[PDB]
Paper text:
Here, we report the atomic structures of an engineered diffocin, a contractile syringe-like molecular machine that kills the Gram-positive bacterium Clostridioides difficile. Captured in one pre-contraction and two post-contraction states, each structure fashions six proteins in the bacteria-targeting baseplate, two proteins in the energy-storing trunk, and a collar linking the sheath with the membrane-penetrating tube. Specific attachment of baseplate tail fibers to receptors on the surface of a target bacterial cell triggers conformational changes of the neighboring baseplate, which leads to reorientation of sheath proteins and contraction of the entire sheath assembly. Since the sheath and the tube are anchored together at the opposite end by the collar, collapsing the sheath pushes the tube through the baseplate, driving it to puncture the cell wall and underlying cytoplasmic membrane.
By applying the corresponding symmetry during single-particle reconstructions, we determined cryoEM structures of the collar, trunk, and baseplate regions of pre-contraction diffocin separately at resolutions of 2.7 Å, 2.2 Å, and 2.6 Å, respectively. The sheath protein (CD1363) has four conformations in the pre-contraction state, all sharing the same structural domains but differing in the tilt angles of the N- and C-terminal extensions. We define these conformations as conformers A, B, C, and D. As the trunk assembles from the baseplate to the collar, conformer A forms the first layer, followed by alternating contributions from conformers B and C, and finally, conformer D terminates the sheath by interacting with the collar. Each sheath subunit engages with its neighboring sheath subunits via the conserved handshake interface, progressively assembling into the complete sheath in the form of stacked hexameric rings with helical symmetry (rise = 79.5 Å and twist = 35°). Four β-strands from three neighboring sheath subunits jointly form the conserved handshake β-sheet. The central tube inside the sheath is formed by stacked hexameric rings of tube protein (CD1364), and the interactions between the tube and different sheath conformers are the same. The inner surface of the tube has a net neutral charge stratified between alternating positive and negative charges, similar to R-type pyocin and T6SS, but different from phages T4 and 80α. The shape of the diffocin in the pre-contraction state mirrors a syringe, and its typical length is about 146 nm.
Author numbering:
A (entry chain e): 3 to 59
B (entry chain r): 296 to 354
C (entry chain F): 3 to 354
D (entry chain r): 178 to 236
E (entry chain G), F (entry chain Z), G (entry chain Y), H (entry chain C), I (entry chain I): 3 to 142
Write the structure that this text describes.
Amino acid sequence: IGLPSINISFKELATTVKERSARGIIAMVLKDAKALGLNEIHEKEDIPVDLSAENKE
Amino acid sequence: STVEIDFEAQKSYLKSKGVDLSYMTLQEIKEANTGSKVFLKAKIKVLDAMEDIDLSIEI
Amino acid sequence: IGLPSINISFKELATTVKERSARGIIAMVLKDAKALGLNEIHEKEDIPVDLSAENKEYINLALMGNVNTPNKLLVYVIEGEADIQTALDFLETKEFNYLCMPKAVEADKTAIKNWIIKLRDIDKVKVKAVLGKVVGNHEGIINFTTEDVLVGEKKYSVDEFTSRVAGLIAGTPLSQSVTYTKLSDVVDIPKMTKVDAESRVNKGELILIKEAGAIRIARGVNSLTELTAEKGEMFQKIKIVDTLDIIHSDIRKVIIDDYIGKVTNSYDNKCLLIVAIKSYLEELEKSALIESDSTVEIDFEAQKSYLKSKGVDLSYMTLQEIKEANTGSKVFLKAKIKVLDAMEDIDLSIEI
Amino acid sequence: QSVTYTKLSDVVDIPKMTKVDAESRVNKGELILIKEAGAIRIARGVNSLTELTAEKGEM
Amino acid sequence: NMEARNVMSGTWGELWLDGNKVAEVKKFQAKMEFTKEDIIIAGQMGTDTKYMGYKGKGSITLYHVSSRMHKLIGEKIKRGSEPRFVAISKLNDPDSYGAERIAVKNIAFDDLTLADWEVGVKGEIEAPFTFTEYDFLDII
Amino acid sequence: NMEARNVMSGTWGELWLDGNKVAEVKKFQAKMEFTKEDIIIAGQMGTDTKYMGYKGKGSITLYHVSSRMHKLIGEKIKRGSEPRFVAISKLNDPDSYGAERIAVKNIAFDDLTLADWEVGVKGEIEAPFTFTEYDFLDII
Amino acid sequence: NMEARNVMSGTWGELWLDGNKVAEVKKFQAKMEFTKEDIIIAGQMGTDTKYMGYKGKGSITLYHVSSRMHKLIGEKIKRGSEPRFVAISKLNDPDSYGAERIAVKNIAFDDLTLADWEVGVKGEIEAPFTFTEYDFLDII
Amino acid sequence: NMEARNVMSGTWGELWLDGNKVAEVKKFQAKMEFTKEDIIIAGQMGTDTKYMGYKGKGSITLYHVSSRMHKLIGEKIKRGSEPRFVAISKLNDPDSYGAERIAVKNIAFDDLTLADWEVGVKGEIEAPFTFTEYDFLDII
Amino acid sequence: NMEARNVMSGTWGELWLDGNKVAEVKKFQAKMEFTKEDIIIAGQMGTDTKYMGYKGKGSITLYHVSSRMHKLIGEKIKRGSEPRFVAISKLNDPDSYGAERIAVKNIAFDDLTLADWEVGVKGEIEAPFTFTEYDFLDII
């Protein structure tokens, strides 16, 4: 369980992204020469690095 | 929290003594005589204390 | 009990003493073969006669403050032929703000630098050291680099004048900064050009300069030079870091004394903790150490992340239920504050 | 209450110990003292039980 | 989307005073009354108002089971030292949308009841107060 | 830990006046009403208060069985000598946590009822008073 | 030593006015209301009072069977001569400890009812008064 | 364009005196009274005036929390060396068009209050003054 | 830093006159009125002033409990030998920053009240005075 951790940290200012919606599912089919299969995507920050820039955008 | 009769332990004890469990009602098993033994079970919950704190201060 | 005493005596005027500061505790490590241990010094006259004269001058240097004398000096004495680690291990237990040691060498400065970085980053105790020639990349290290400081026809090296600097910093009220503070007792310093002073200040050094009038401090910077998104330019200033360390110490005291291991980790007790911290911040706002409109609240993103890391299913779970969910023995909070800087740079354009 | 972080005032000196070593000792099942600004204190109110099973949890 | 079950019942209220739970609480009230002053504008038939500030007023009622208020303020009031307090009120009805928790701060009580009893009547204590600040924790 | 049986019943009250037990007591009340004056602080929307002191007010009700009040004050009041008294109130409910006993001192009564009767109505006496000091003996 | 039977019943009251028995009396009341003025003492938080005097106030209610009050005061009041009276009230309950008899003196009535009647309502007369003196005869 | 919310409230006023902020300020006044002399012109029925100068008059009222005025002027006035001061007044109501900030210079106070206290009354200080110069910073 | 509790209450005032404590004091005043003469400078629209001196004025109010002022001054004033006094005023409110103690010296009273009574009114005495010197002991 480790030692007790009491950490008070100071840091510069930061922003907040928009809240999410539980409405809307889109199916998109694209042809690629690498990493064939089914890929579920939750956010645009996390897209697997295999796809081309053209398909990434 | 709850307290109740430990039905399964009573059944295992009754089996160990040699009584029949087929053609016996569940009420019949629950109220059966058990010599000098009493089988019970319960359920409780207990919470932890405060020992770790994270406070992130933006300046 | 004796006879009644009506004792009326006459004498000439006595020299006034500068007022004491409620803030600022200095620990200084000295070496002498005699009178070892820890000595607590309050006034300039109370100095154990067993120390050599040089150590007496070092203590007298640390006693002089800027606007007030430092609140307290803690003196630890070691004979020698031993590691400085022996004094550092003992000082790990005491409470102080600044650490200096007039006699040191490169490996000894390395020990002090590593020790203070360890305390600040791992042991979560905000302390600072004033060292002679150290290139620490930390806000906990103040690099005072000025050679051969002359006071009253004497020779002070860079490492042995840091007692005066530490007393100066500890003697300054929190609303002010040490930039352009003048040292009346200093008489001479080596010839220095403005371009060189600019370069040294840019590199993170605390230096003396000769300006209009007497000798004074150039700028109130730390040794920090590498700036990231989390750590901007404000972390380079001595005054800001002093305020932040005071906030850290006070909040830590409240938490450790009243809450750790004392109360069950339920949502009601978390709310009580939030109210306590908010009241402390309001107290700070009433003294103008920080600006108005500061906030404290539950850190929702961090709690969601912890709950997810434990295998909880955040599906059709209300935001209220997530906010109030049990989190073992952990608490996630966040806050916002604002601190202002001192006046240091002025442009005035005059049309004639 | 718990004895976690309870301070012992009359103690004034303790052998030095690094943080990773203290972590490892606590995870081994030992009650240890640690050094802090101010007095000395207990690290974590832990047992010597280390082998956990489906019937004996971390509580 | 509005149902009768959503209305909050006062039986699901809780109260902390000076950091301590008040198990014998009967009612809790806190309200900001605005100071408004009339201003007649030339050419306008309807009289308007200017907002100048507010006065915080409240009250607590308890069943008489202990000497809570006596211990809180009695000796200090006689010596000329007036204490100030923080109260936290929570309303969490299981059939409502959510919980409403509010901190009321800088509380100064209006009086102190030393004794109030009558034969055949159960004891209750009514304690009015004033206040100047507040904070929202968990609004709906 | 809060139970309905813990609430103190007024039937378990007793009263001493001028050192004598009052067996015919119906109710007893004593309260300190604080004097508070408004103070508006520049830059603050909520108006605060300053505590200036207090005024002690109380009352006693008795069944009419004797001429207790007449003997206590009647002849002295007419001559211009005003007497002052000490009262001790005790509340000791056997089902409560403990007892509450308070001495109320420097009592000055507000009036004197010489007669108040009506055909078909049982006699009662209400005696308001003021006071300035008190002591706690056996709080809960 | 306190029993419910000891409480005095108002049905056992009697009244004499101007030396004559009043058989039709319904209620009688007489009370001294003290004049008290606040005095704040330097260094004391509790406000004290100074006794300055009293004002006697009372009332009589009668069933309307005759013209008693008309004859007592009507002609004299119109001419500017105001009469003053003595009243004696006695309360003697056979189950009480003893009797209470008090003389109320220098009585001046507050008004005079010439007529007050309503169809379907039995007649009654309420006569308030003031007074300045009294004597105790047979207190308990 | 004009609405009741635009009227400036006095609660949003702040004051600096001799470089130091005074948090206990209750009110602030400063005004220039013009000196005018009548002049009758031959052939004209309406009498006109000639402007000759002005005299600056003002006042500050504070809650009594410290000995501010004593320290500012008491010792110097006794020795015969009169000090002069600068005051800055700011009025910044969030619902108004903007801020109004004014410096009032060469201030000479009219008197000094050593003590003014009464039992049951909170302490206040009134300090009138005269002045000759001013400057506009942030007009609307 | 500035809160309503810091305002000094007059109930915490105390007074010494000619070395003897005055327990019956109601209020105390002492103030220095400056003498100022107008001066118009050529080329300047704002008229300035020159400080010339001061006149000390004050007063004391007491509840009438004894013949204090009679004994202090009556016989001496008739013979033509005017006495002079020292007064010490102390204001020590427990909720304030600290105590304010001042000595007012060379006091000469303006009059002497031999009698002032009215039926139904409690007695009070007002005693104005003049003074020339003072000293600060315990400023804030």
